[PDB]
Amino acid sequence: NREEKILNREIGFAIGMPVCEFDMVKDPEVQDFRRNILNVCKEAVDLRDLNSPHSRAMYVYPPNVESSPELPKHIYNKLDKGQIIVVIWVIVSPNNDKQKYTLKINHDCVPEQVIAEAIGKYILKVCGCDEYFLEKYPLSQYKYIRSCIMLGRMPNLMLMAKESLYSQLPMDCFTMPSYSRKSLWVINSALRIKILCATYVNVKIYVRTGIYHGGEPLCDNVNTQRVPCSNPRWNEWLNYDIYIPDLPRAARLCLSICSHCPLAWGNINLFDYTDTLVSGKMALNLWPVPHGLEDLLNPIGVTGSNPNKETPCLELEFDWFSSVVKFPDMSVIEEHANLRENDKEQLKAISTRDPLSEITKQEKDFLWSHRHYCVTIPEILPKLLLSVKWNSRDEVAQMYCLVKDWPPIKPEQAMELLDCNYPDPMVRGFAVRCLEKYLTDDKLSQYLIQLVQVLKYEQYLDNLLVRFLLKKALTNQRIGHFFFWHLKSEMHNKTVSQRFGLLLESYCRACGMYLKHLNRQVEAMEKLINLTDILKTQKVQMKFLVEQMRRPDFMDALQGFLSPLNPAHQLGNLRLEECRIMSSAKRPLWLNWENPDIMSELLFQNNEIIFKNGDDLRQDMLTLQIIRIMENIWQNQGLDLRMLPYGCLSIGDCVGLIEVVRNSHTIMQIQCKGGNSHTLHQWLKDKNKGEIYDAAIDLFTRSCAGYCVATFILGIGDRHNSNIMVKDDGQLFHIDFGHFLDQDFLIVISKGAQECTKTREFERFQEMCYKAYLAIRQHANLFINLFSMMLGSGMPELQSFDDIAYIRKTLALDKTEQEALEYFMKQMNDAHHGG
Numbered sequence: 001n002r003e004e005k006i007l008n009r010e011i012g013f014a015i016g017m018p019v020c021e022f023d024m025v026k027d028p029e030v031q032d033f034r035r036n037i038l039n040v041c042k043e044a045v046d047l048r049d050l051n052s053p054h055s056r057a058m059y060v061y062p063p064n065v066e067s068s069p070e071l072p073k074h075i076y077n078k079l080d081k082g083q084i085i086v087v088i089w090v091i092v093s094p095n096n097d098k099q100k101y102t103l104k105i106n107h108d109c110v111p112e113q114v115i116a117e118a119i120g121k122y123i124l125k126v127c128g129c130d131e132y133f134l135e136k137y138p139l140s141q142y143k144y145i146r147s148c149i150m151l152g153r154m155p156n157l158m159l160m161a162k163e164s165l166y167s168q169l170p171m172d173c174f175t176m177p178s179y180s181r182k183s184l185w186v187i188n189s190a191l192r193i194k195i196l197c198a199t200y201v202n203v204k205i206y207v208r209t210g211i212y213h214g215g216e217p218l219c220d221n222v223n224t225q226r227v228p229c230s231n232p233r234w235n236e237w238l239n240y241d242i243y244i245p246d247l248p249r250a251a252r253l254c255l256s257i258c259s260h261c262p263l264a265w266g267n268i269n270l271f272d273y274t275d276t277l278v279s280g281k282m283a284l285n286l287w288p289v290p291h292g293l294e295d296l297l298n299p300i301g302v303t304g305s306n307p308n309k310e311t312p313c314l315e316l317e318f319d320w321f322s323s324v325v326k327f328p329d330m331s332v333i334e335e336h337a338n339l340r341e342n343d344k345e346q347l348k349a350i351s352t353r354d355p356l357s358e359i360t361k362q363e364k365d366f367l368w369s370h371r372h373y374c375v376t377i378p379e380i381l382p383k384l385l386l387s388v389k390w391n392s393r394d395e396v397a398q399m400y401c402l403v404k405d406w407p408p409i410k411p412e413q414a415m416e417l418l419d420c421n422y423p424d425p426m427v428r429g430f431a432v433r434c435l436e437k438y439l440t441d442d443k444l445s446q447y448l449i450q451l452v453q454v455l456k457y458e459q460y461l462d463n464l465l466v467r468f469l470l471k472k473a474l475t476n477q478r479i480g481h482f483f484f485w486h487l488k489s490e491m492h493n494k495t496v497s498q499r500f501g502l503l504l505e506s507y508c509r510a511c512g513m514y515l516k517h518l519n520r521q522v523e524a525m526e527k528l529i530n531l532t533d534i535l536k537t538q539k540v541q542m543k544f545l546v547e548q549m550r551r552p553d554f555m556d557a558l559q560g561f562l563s564p565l566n567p568a569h570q571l572g573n574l575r576l577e578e579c580r581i582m583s584s585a586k587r588p589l590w591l592n593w594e595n596p597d598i599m600s601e602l603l604f605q606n607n608e609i610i611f612k613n614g615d616d617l618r619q620d621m622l623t624l625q626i627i628r629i630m631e632n633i634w635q636n637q638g639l640d641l642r643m644l645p646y647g648c649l650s651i652g653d654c655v656g657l658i659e660v661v662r663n664s665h666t667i668m669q670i671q672c673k674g675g676n677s678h679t680l681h682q683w684l685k686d687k688n689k690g691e692i693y694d695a696a697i698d699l700f701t702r703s704c705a706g707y708c709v710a711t712f713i714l715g716i717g718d719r720h721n722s723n724i725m726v727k728d729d730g731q732l733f734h735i736d737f738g739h740f741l742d743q744d745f746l747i748v749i750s751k752g753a754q755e756c757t758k759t760r761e762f763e764r765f766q767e768m769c770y771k772a773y774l775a776i777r778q779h780a781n782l783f784i785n786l787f788s789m790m791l792g793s794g795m796p797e798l799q800s801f802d803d804i805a806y807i808r809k810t811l812a813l814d815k816t817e818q819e820a821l822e823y824f825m826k827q828m829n830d831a832h833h834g835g
């Protein structure tokens with residue numbers, strides 16, 4: 001076929017695993033997933049082609065927008081009576097002559113008004129990248145115009161006739177592949193499950209078991225007798241304290257061959273995606289030794305079986321009811337389940353506490369009793385759920401009248417419900433139902449790294465989170481682009497390869513034309529991915545890389561595609577001269593691309609990117625996104641702390657891409673230390689003289705107050721002279737993040753004086769440093785939720801809550817607002833010896 005086979009090899013390249021290899025998968029829980037049940041995502045395509053070509057265009061080019069419509073008061077003061085001056089680079093002649101035009105327009109206007117003033121047949125293109133002003137959003141909402149107003153930059157916006165884009169987007173529609181087309185509450189018996197034997201036991205060995213719903217034990221942890229290692233003929237019908245109807249929906253039984261150190265752990269759902277209590281013999285390969293865990297079991301893991309079949313396999317014999325028993329529908333459960341001194345104040349004391357606050361059982365019973373009032377205060381839902389034992393049918397039934405009827409909570413609050421705890425299929429249903437309705441495309445863009453890692457927390461392959469993420473990826477090629485590259489990064493993990501290959505190929509069938517560009521991205525990456533592996537010492541390196549991009553096969557894949565950091569950055573022919581290799585630890589690729597846009601000179605004549613291959617960049621993105629929200633809740637309250645949360649994307653295993661800031665000058669190891677202690681201020685002064693000397697100092701403090709407290713609140717690592725850089729408008733920021741939660745700058749704030757503490761400018765630096773954590777400690781629930789969502793990300797730092805206790809220490813969440821003022825002051829006056 002010319003429509004089925006046209007796509008099934010492009011897909012095999014854009015995932016790296018042939019669709020044939022997943023056609024031959026014998027596991028019954030893949031074919032049911034891939035069938036038309038997910039292919040209702042074609043409705044997403046129906047959404048993206050509803051009103052052609054405007055709907056198609058808004059799909060293909062996603063606006064980059066700020067989540068804050070109303071411009072803040074200080075940014076409003078950054079404007080001349082709330083007015084921005086923008087240059088319009090009209091092109092009319094067929095030649096290269098450009099007719100520019102300058103306009104003074106109210107910052108609350110719209111691209112339609114810009115079109116009307118400059119002169120609907122035209123669209124505004126950001127001059128130097130394929131950023132397009134298309135939909136009816138205010139000018140100041142776009143990140144380009146908002147950043148222009150913030151930095152006082154001169155905004156550049158060329159005019160292009162719409163036909164130059166409407167006719168530049170060939171259509172590519174959706175063709176389906178060949179695969180297009182008792183009750184557990186009436187039994188009376190304890191949980192009685194047999195261990196047969198282990199096929200590949202490794203050298204009194206016993207199976208330690210237990211029922212878990214979360215990290216919470218659901219009964220006594222039944223064990224086996226101590227058989228000899230040679231012949232593990234267990235054959236034991238272990239009797240669990242858990243009565244079978246009491247088994248909850250997500251109650252994966254946890255095996256542990258234990259020599260009480262677990263030789264091998266493994267989770268197995270006590271249900272399945274069709275709500276069937278697993279029966280019959282089951283030979284499952286067990287997962288390797290727990291990663292940094294000395295627990296009695298390892299419920300911190302994935303359900304199902306191990307794809308690697310060389311691991312010790314244990315044989316099990318589940319319940320034999322001589323029939324099939326199904327978990328009741330939610331209607332039957334719901335039918336089954338069918339004051340101001342502290343009953344209103346203690347509740348608010350709980351709600352305002354972080355989810356990491358260990359709720360006492362004496363207070364868990366208080367939370368449990370006031371179900372009828374905790375429903376009125378929404379932000380307590382993450383804590384009411386933990387106030388319920390999953391040992392019981394009646395307890396969980398009582399909750400299912402609450403979390404199903406719970407009024408929706410704010411999206412950053414509903415993102416905690418998708419962690420390792422809260423593993424109920426309906427808790428995550430509520431979390432995703434809130435995340436769909438309230439989360440916006442740029443907040444989703446920030447939080448997508450979190451949402452990808454919580455696919456692994458839902459127990460079946462056809463989640464509702466999968467549906468949400470796929471539908472969003474089929475409407476913007478930023479959710480699509482970054483979702484695709486997140487999954488491609490997490491393909492190399494065998495644990496989630498089965499999920500993520502199917503998810504990827506579900507996306508590669510309905511993304512559209514972008515797949516080719518996506519392939520051209522992947523191809524362009526896999527040469528660089530190859531190139532780095534070829535590379536794994538500079539002049540030979542420089543000439544080798546020049547030779548390796550001058551070849552026609554290499555130069556073909558490395559030209560005319562889009563940046564994996566920004567598809568709006570239309571990469572053209574490589575600037576062969578300005579591409580080099582650093583003398584760094586992993587030797588990343590400094591790569592420069594000329595802009596095929598006619599007028600490259602406005603934003604940037606050339607596009608610069610760092611290509612790291614060897615270091616994980618999920619923690620780097622985690623730091624940069626925490627920085628982004630911290631800035632957005634500092635620069636929305638009027639505390640004009642200035643910083644740069646820039647682009648970062650890990651494209652595979654420990655391989656990724658970083659947008660170079662060319663404005664930010666050399667590292668301070670040379671820009672300040674010259675690879676004397678007065679170099680930084682002198683260099684900043686000689687590069688900024690006159691009446692402009694205010695901001696170049698004024699924005700330095702606001703660029704050092706917000707990063708001394710960010711490196712504090714999140715416990716970020718050491719700040720060497722090779723880790724910090726500085727712009728020329730006084731801005732500085734940190735670039736080499738990574739692992740965390742584990743004076744030259746002083747004289748600049750005092751404007752060159754060798755004595756700084758006595759100065760008033762140092763005092764204002766302190767008084768904005770304090771206001772920095774005044775609101776960050778007011779917004780701690782968001783940060784705790786975000787940190788908690790990355791526990792199963794595989795990051796070596798976020799393994800358990802014992803590491804998120806570090807941010808608890810740094811923010812001191814237990815103390816009162818007045819008492820927390822001196823908490824930072826102690827370490828702050830310890831760092832610089834007085835303040």
Ligand SMILES: Cc1nc(NC(=O)N2CCC[C@H]2C(N)=O)sc1-c1ccnc(C(C)(C)C(F)(F)F)c1
Binds near residue numbers: 666
């Ligand atoms: C965001 C960003 N902007 C840069 N800017 C220049 O390097 N510039 C700016 C122009 C000249 C050049 C220079 N020598 O000054 S670097 C950088 C960055 C971000 C993250 N990690 C790194 C490295 C180099 C430490 C790593 F780890 F990748 F090797 C760099």
